[PDB]
Amino acid sequence: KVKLFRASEPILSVLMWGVNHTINELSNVPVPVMLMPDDFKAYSKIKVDNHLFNKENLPSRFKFKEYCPMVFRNLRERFGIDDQDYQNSVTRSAPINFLTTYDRRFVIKTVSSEDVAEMHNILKKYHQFIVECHGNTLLPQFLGMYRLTVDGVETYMVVTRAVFSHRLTVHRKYDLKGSVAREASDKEKAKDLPTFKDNDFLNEGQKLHVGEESKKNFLEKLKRDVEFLAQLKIMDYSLLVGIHDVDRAEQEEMEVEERAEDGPGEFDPSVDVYAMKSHESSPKKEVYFMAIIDILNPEQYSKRFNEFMSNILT
Amino acid sequence: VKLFRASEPILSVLMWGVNHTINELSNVPVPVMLMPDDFKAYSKIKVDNHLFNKENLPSRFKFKEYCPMVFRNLRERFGIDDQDYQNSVTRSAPINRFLTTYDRRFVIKTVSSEDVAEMHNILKKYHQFIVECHGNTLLPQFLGMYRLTVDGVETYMVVTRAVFSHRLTVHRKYDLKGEASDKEKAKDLPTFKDNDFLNEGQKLHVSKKNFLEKLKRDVEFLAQLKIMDYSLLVGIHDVDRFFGPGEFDPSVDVYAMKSHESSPVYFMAIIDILTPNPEQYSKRFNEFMSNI
Ligand SMILES: Nc1ncnc2c1ncn2[C@@H]1O[C@H](COP(=O)(O)O)[C@@H](O)[C@H]1O
Numbered sequence A: 001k002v003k004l005f006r007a008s009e010p011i012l013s014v015l016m017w018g019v020n021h022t023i024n025e026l027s028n029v030p031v032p033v034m035l036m037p038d039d040f041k042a043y044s045k046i047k048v049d050n051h052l053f054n055k056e057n058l059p060s061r062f063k064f065k066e067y068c069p070m071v072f073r074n075l076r077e078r079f080g081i082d083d084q085d086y087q088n089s090v091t092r093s094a095p096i097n098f099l100t101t102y103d104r105r106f107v108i109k110t111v112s113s114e115d116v117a118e119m120h121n122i123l124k125k126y127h128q129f130i131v132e133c134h135g136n137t138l139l140p141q142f143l144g145m146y147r148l149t150v151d152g153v154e155t156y157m158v159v160t161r162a163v164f165s166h167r168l169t170v171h172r173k174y175d176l177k178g179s180v181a182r183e184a185s186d187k188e189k190a191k192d193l194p195t196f197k198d199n200d201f202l203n204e205g206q207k208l209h210v211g212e213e214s215k216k217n218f219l220e221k222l223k224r225d226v227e228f229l230a231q232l233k234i235m236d237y238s239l240l241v242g243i244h245d246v247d248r249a250e251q252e253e254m255e256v257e258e259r260a261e262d263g264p265g266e267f268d269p270s271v272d273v274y275a276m277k278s279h280e281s282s283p284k285k286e287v288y289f290m291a292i293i294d295i296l297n298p299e300q301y302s303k304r305f306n307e308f309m310s311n312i313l314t
Numbered sequence B: 001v002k003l004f005r006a007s008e009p010i011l012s013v014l015m016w017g018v019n020h021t022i023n024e025l026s027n028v029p030v031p032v033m034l035m036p037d038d039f040k041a042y043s044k045i046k047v048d049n050h051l052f053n054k055e056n057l058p059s060r061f062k063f064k065e066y067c068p069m070v071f072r073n074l075r076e077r078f079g080i081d082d083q084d085y086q087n088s089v090t091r092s093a094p095i096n097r098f099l100t101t102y103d104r105r106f107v108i109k110t111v112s113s114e115d116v117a118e119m120h121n122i123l124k125k126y127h128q129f130i131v132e133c134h135g136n137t138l139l140p141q142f143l144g145m146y147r148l149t150v151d152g153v154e155t156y157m158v159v160t161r162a163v164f165s166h167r168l169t170v171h172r173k174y175d176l177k178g179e180a181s182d183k184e185k186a187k188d189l190p191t192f193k194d195n196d197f198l199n200e201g202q203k204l205h206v207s208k209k210n211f212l213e214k215l216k217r218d219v220e221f222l223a224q225l226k227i228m229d230y231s232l233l234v235g236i237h238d239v240d241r242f243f244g245p246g247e248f249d250p251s252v253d254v255y256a257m258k259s260h261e262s263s264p265v266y267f268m269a270i271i272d273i274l275t276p277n278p279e280q281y282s283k284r285f286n287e288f289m290s291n292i
């Protein structure tokens, strides 16, 4: 029951402390019929000074600001994330790393003041857009926005649902825009899990085999989402593409158990929300994770971007 | 769901405060011993809530808890569970500056800046003493001490275990020191004094052997601390005027004593000891008390 907020860096402990603290407060705050325009200009601020006390893991002094907390609670509900689960993923053990919760469910990115600014501008429209699509979207699902202060330095963070599966392993990833001229630098290509780009993707004849029912529901999301990004005049985002090779993982698992001594391709679509199985007619048995990232030629992109993503599938 | 709904925002800040600090403490490992820094420690939290959660709480306020490790240890030495303490302050607004939790278990006195300084002054020796008497004493049992800042105004408070039962009711008080005013002598709860008590030649029939042995070591300890002006709060519950009458849980009503057989319930403890002849006040109080 006892949380120590132990982390490799103080910032992280403060993060764990803040999510823990703010989620508990929300738990005493009745759940509103609807949201109100002020909820979109609201915030919580807490400043801690702990003298000669409770300093094993937390600094004596820090600040924690949560943006628009009523809105993000409701956003969580819409995306079917229970506050307690969220709270636990962040607090049970330090996030890892751009961070991930220890259980790989939530991404936590550090962002700009301008990003936080941009979140506010698009927030009323984004909330409404999440409602009229019932949370069915390739877009980032935003769960919280925070400003931490440690040693008088301010850090902004945005929490999202993870694109990749919290269990299944990604063996190959791309970041796609659709033009110009994009590839992975010999630097990247020589990393463990290179972020490949379009020309890399096109250049390798890469195709994803998902089957018609899935392809249609995916393309119908992509269409609505990217029109929304066009309306909001947003630009330069990407389609994160993760590929899981089922047989490869099973072998990797087997090699993992043998070493220790000295089911495959399955995922819960309620948790691994961006994941699609490969069509039974696929070369390899694969699992794909696809979503739009980095939303923080306007109507052009919409078309440029959309036509491309549409050609990845079969 | 805890709303911290209360008449005064200061009562809401208090409920929020006790709730927050008790939760925080539940993530703090209980140490093998208190350290000298624990007697110089505090928690401070400043809250600034724009357009949020303002139904019962102010939007801006401060809450400071003095020496939280020491007072949590004091709670344990007084056999009070943290979560019960939290529940008592927090489920419903403290009641009736002098307060009790809605369930009558704990008293909440506003005090002065100098009181808080006096408490810091005596705390180590007060702790050492509670350790030594194994919690058995008529002194006030200090459970927490706090400073609230609301509308830019600081308020200090000291939480104690109640003298009077939180169940059984009282029909007569006494404030013995070794008399009552007119406008007072009309109150529903008449706070009599030594003279009123002698006047009616009353003497609680009792135990008195141990009770007095206790009261003695207590007042000798107040003496060595050069403290004075404290009284003995005495309560009287009429039996005659589910649960039976005269029935109480000694582990909760810790000061309560049922009347002897040969006589025609008494609650008794020492109160108000943050006041500052000391050795002197001691015997006037002890010698006088040893009479009733
Ligand atoms: N309610 C708001 N509406 C629009 N922009 C905001 C709001 N709150 C903060 N920002 C912007 O977000 C960035 C960080 O804000 P601050 O929380 O004051 O550090 C700055 O660019 C602010 O102007």
Ligand SMILES: Nc1ncnc2c1ncn2[C@@H]1O[C@H](COP(=O)(O)O)[C@@H](O)[C@H]1O
Residues within 6 Å of the ligand: A098, A107, A160, A161, A162, A163, A164, A175, A195, A240, A293, A294
């Ligand atoms: N929501 C997400 N889930 C998983 N990986 C991400 C997510 N967002 C970004 N990334 C990856 O993390 C890094 C951050 O992107 P960038 O904005 O280019 O620094 C890149 O390597 C991305 O491939």
Ligand SMILES: Nc1ncnc2c1ncn2[C@@H]1O[C@H](COP(=O)(O)O)[C@@H](O)[C@H]1O
Residues within 6 Å of the ligand: A251, A255
């Ligand atoms: N069932 C299998 N499927 C694919 N590759 C395998 C399999 N078993 C062994 N290998 C590969 O054979 C090499 C030796 O494997 P091991 O038998 O674990 O020494 C490794 O490269 C394994 O990945």
